[PDB]
């Protein structure tokens, strides 16, 4: 069936859209080639519509059925509970999309009578009615990228499809416990969202070492959300239903599946009918869990079809990496084609065709790769990095323009040991926080799709707990990593190391001069910038820091605030 049908009504914005990085003294000090940085807008929604719209053909075989049976068996070991209206309300981001029924996210969080009553009525309706398609809004996302000259043309806007706030709270009540606990039970060590960046590195390295002649590949599905069929979504529901659930949960899950998850009408911000969806909704609670299960099922079966030897998968939504035993270069290329053919039959055709890789450092998954640097003792150590282009472009935008959610803070947290997060992101943003006297102000950021309020002054202990003390003393980064950063700095027009070091020393001195948590930031985050090093001992606050909850599950598109 067609992933989408369209009426001709436009996908409309509801606020002004800026497409060019503005000229701004603060962002200019970070990167001067502002014309390289753009944001997507509703103007390119038509381009995206064409890309996401196609007929899916799906044929299922014995391998598919076998894997599904195994997954259901694991799912049957899971007991999940309904959330109360209170608990669900508390998971709603403060700035989540308001309801069309006269209340917003703040009212939901405050347990406002108008909010809570409508939620109860939506829930009751889910129980009474298991057929009527539920309305969704479709919007073009405004996301920031750098121009890729070698590729041609800007990325068009991604779309988001989401039901009303009232429905989203009901999804949490029925399914929050399921989507938080089920994936790890079903997929075990293959479930990527259970890992911190360091734990992800550990899993990848150990998996690589477990093979005699390791070979790995990332598999890019062409528009994964759109490839997801009614069958796939019903199969996901059948997996959910294997859980030990309350009767009202079972009914609500069945209802949400029939009325929302399988498909439904698309409405623009002007209230006009834009068309109809028969694929994954990108803005529902089950997007991440559904994609992860479905990607895992199809890939596991395709591994068997391709007769890959000892395939180990790591899955995060639609992001898939496979590590296996090499059968030789020609044999590997042939087996990857068979894998691709199998995935295609399952309705997960390739974007870029998968390529066998024999160096672990060259495998990119979740937009990231393992690399090597040296710790204080000179020992080679593994850590997670990524190309810094998008992080830096977004940092520049977030410098020039105010936004609730700050990718830069998430990037510092997740990539704290990296050359670029330390040299550039920490230096740049602490200089701004110093200038603004806003070090004490908590900021919102995203980790694995969930939103968190984080105090920048807590960064030293957060980094220690997450990455260890070595994050503050890594040096001698790999030539490949240094070269990649070098290319980025040239492309974006970012100042060189000598400039960042100078800026960092000044930032550090000021932080130190202020005492308290500010001084701890100066000492630990910027020790790299000084000749006369300070001794970096374990921070007492880090030992009593429970960073569990951060890496339990993925919630991208799921409207989750922790
Ligand atoms: C990209 C290239 C043209 O320039 C650089 C080369 C190396 C580095 C790393 C410098 C280093 C890090 C420490 C954390 C931030 C800067 C690590 C290192 O090996 C020595 C050092 O003085 O600091 C940055 C650079 F910007």
| DSSP per-residue letters across 386-422 | --SHHHHHHHHHHHHS--SB-HHHHHHHHTTTSHHII
Task: Give kind and range of the element (H or E) at residue 452.
Answer: strand 450-454
CA distance 553 to 176: 10
Torsion over CA: 554, 557, 558, 561 (sign): positive
Specify the 3-state DSSP secondary structure of 328.
coil
Helices (H), 76-129: 85-90, 105-109, 113-128
Bridge pairing between strands 136-140 and 159-162: antiparallel
Question: What are the backbone dihedrals phi and psi of residue 494, each rounded to the nearest 5 degrees, phi first?
Answer: -90, 135
Please state, in angstroms and rounded to a whole number, the distance separating the CA atoms of residues 562 and 549. Answer: 8
Q: How far, in Å, CA of 398 to CA of 535, rounded?
A: 33
Length of the chain: 562
By most ligand atoms within 8 Å of CB, the mutation choice from 31, 416, 423 for ligand 1 is 423
Centre of ligand 1 from the C-alpha of residue 418, in Å: 10
Report CA(419)–ligand 1 centroid distance (Å). Answer: 6
- The answer to whether 358 touches 370, Cβ cutoff 8 Å, is no
497 CA to centre of ligand 1 in angstroms:
6
Q: For ligand 1, atom 7, name the residue with the nearest CA.
A: 482
Q: Please tell me the distance from the alpha carbon of residue 529 to that of residue 523, in angstroms, as a whole number.
A: 10
Give the mutation target among 31, 479, 485 for probing the ligand 1 site: most ligand atoms within 8 A of CB: 485
**319 marked ligand binding residue:** yes
CATH of domain 188-228+286-365: 3.30.70.270
Declared resolution, Å: 1.6
**Ligand 1 contacts CB of residue 329 (under 6 A):** no
Q: Using CA positions, which residue lies closest to atom 20 of ligand 1?
A: 475
d(CA 73, CA 349) in angstroms, rounded, equals: 28
Cβ of residue 499 lying under 6 Å from some atom of ligand 1: no
Q: How far apart are CA 137 and CA 151, in angstroms?
A: 31
Could you give phi then psi for residue 232, rounded to 5 degrees? -60, -40
Q: How far is CA 368 from CA 180, 418, 481, in A?
A: 23, 12, 12
What ranges make up the beta strands (E) of 209-301? 214-219, 264-267, 273-277
Taking each continuous run of H as one helix and of E as one strand, the counts in the chain are: 22, 14
- Spatial separation of the C-alpha atoms in residues 530 and 352, rounded to whole Å: 44
Query: Does residue 281 have its Cβ closer than 6 Å to ligand 1?
Result: no
For tokens 């709270």, name the residue: 169
Q: What is the largest CA-CA distance in the chain?
A: 71
* Angstrom distance (rounded) from CA 445 to CA 306: 40
Least Cα distance to 41 among 71, 8, 65, 11 occurs for 11
Distance 28 CA to ligand 1 centre (A): 21
Nearest by Cα to 348 from 292, 280, 295 = 295
Q: Give, in order, the Cα–Cα distances in Å from 410 to each of 395, 421, 426, 526.
A: 11, 11, 12, 18
CA gyration radius for the chain?
A: 24
Q: Which two tokens stand for residue 373?
A: 């640097």
Domain boundaries, the chain: 1-55+133-163+263-278, 56-132+164-187+229-262+279-285, 188-228+286-365, 367-562
Q: Which atom of ligand 1 is nearest to the CA of 482?
A: 1
CA of 3 to the centre of ligand 1 (A): 47
By C-alpha distance, which of 182, 172, 180, 181 is closest to 82? Answer: 172
The minimum-distance atom of ligand 1 relative to the CA of 373 is: 19
Q: Kindly state the helix (H) or strand (E) to which residue 322 belongs, with its residue range.
A: strand 319-325
Experimental determination approach used = X-ray
220 labeled part of a ligand binding site: yes
3-state secondary structure 58-85: CCCCHHHHHHHHHHHHHHCCCECCCCCH
DSSP run (H or E) holding 369: strand 369-374
Rounded to the nearest angstrom, the distance between the alpha carbon of 433 and the centre of ligand 1 is 23
- Assess whether the C-beta atom of 528 lies below 6 angstroms from ligand 1: yes
Cα of first residue to Cα of last residue in the chain, in angstroms, is 37
Q: How far is the CA of 66 from the centre of ligand 1 (A)?
A: 50
The answer to whether 20 and 43 have CB atoms below 8 angstroms apart is no
Residue 289: in which H helix or E strand, if any?
A: helix 287-305
- What 3-state DSSP class applies to 161? strand
Per-residue tokens: 128: 């009474």
> Residue 314 pairs with which residues in a beta bridge?
321
């Amino acid at each position: 069936s067609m992933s989408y049908t369209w009426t001709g009504a436009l996908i409309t914005p509801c606020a002004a859209e800026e497409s060019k990085l503005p000229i701004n003294a603060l962002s200019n000090s970070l990167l001067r080639h502002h014309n390289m940085v753009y944001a997507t807008t509703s103007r390119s929604a038509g381009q995206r519509q064409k890309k996401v719209t196609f007929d899916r053909l799906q044929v299922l075989d014995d391998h598919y059925r076998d894997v599904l049976k195994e997954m259901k068996a694991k799912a049957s070991t899971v007991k999940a509970k309904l959330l109360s209206v209170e608990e669900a309300c508390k998971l709603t981001p403060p700035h989540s999309a308001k309801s069309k029924y006269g209340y917003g996210a703040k009212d939901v969080r405050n347990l406002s009578s108008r909010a809570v009553n409508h939620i109860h009525s939506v829930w009751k309706d889910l129980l009474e009615d298991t057929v009527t398609p539920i309305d969704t809004t479709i919007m073009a996302k405004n996301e920031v990228f750098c121009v890729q000259p070698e590729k041609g043309g800007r990325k068009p806007a991604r779309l988001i499809v989401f039901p009303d706030l009232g429905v989203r709270v009901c999804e949490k009540m029925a399914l929050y416990d399921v989507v938080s606990t089920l994936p790890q039970v079903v997929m075990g060590s293959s479930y990527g969202f259970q890992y911190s960046p360091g734990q992800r590195v550990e899993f990848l390295v150990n998996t690589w070492k477990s093979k005699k002649n390791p070979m790995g590949f990332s598999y890019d599905t062409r528009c994964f959300d759109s490839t997801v069929t009614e069958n796939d979504i019903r199969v996901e529901e059948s997996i959910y239903q294997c859980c030990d659930l309350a009767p009202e949960a079972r009914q609500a899950i069945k209802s949400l599946t029939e009325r929302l998850y399988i498909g439904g009408p698309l409405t623009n911000s002007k209230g006009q009918n834009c068309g109809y969806r028969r694929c994954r909704a990108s803005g529902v609670l089950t997007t991440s869990c559904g994609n992860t299960l479905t990607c895992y099922l199809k890939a596991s079966a395709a591994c068997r079809a391709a007769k890959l030897q000892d395939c180990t998968m790591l899955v995060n939504g639609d992001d898939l990496v496979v590590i296996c035993e090499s059968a030789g270069t020609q044999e590997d290329a042939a087996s990857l084609r068979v894998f691709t053919e199998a995935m295609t039959r399952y309705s997960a055709p390739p974007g870029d065709p998968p390529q066998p890789e024999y160096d672990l450092e060259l495998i990119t998954s979740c937009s990231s790769n393992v690399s090597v640097a040296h710790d204080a003792s000179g020992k080679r150590v593994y850590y997670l990095t990524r190309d810094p282009t998008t992080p830096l472009a977004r940092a520049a935008w977030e410098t020039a323009r105010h936004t609730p959610v700050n990718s830069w803070l998430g990037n510092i947290i997740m990539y704290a040991p990296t050359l670029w997060a330390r040299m550039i992101l920490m230096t740049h943003f602490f200089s701004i926080l110093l200038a603004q006297e806003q070090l004490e102000k908590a900021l919102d950021c995203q980790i694995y799709g969930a939103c968190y309020s984080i105090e920048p002054l807590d960064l030293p202990q957060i980094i220690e707990r997450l990455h260890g003390l070595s994050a503050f003393s890594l040096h001698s980064y790999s030539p490949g990593e240094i070269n990649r950063v070098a290319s980025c700095l040239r492309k974006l027009g970012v100042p060189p190391l000598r400039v960042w070091r100078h800026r960092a020393r000044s930032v550090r001195a000021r932080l130190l001069s202020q005492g308290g948590r500010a001084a701890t930031c100066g000492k630990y985050l910027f020790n790299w910038a000084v000749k006369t090093k300070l001794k970096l001992t374990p921070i007492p606050a880090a030992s009593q820091l429970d960073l569990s909850g951060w890496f339990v599950a993925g919630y991208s598109g799921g409207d989750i605030y922790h």
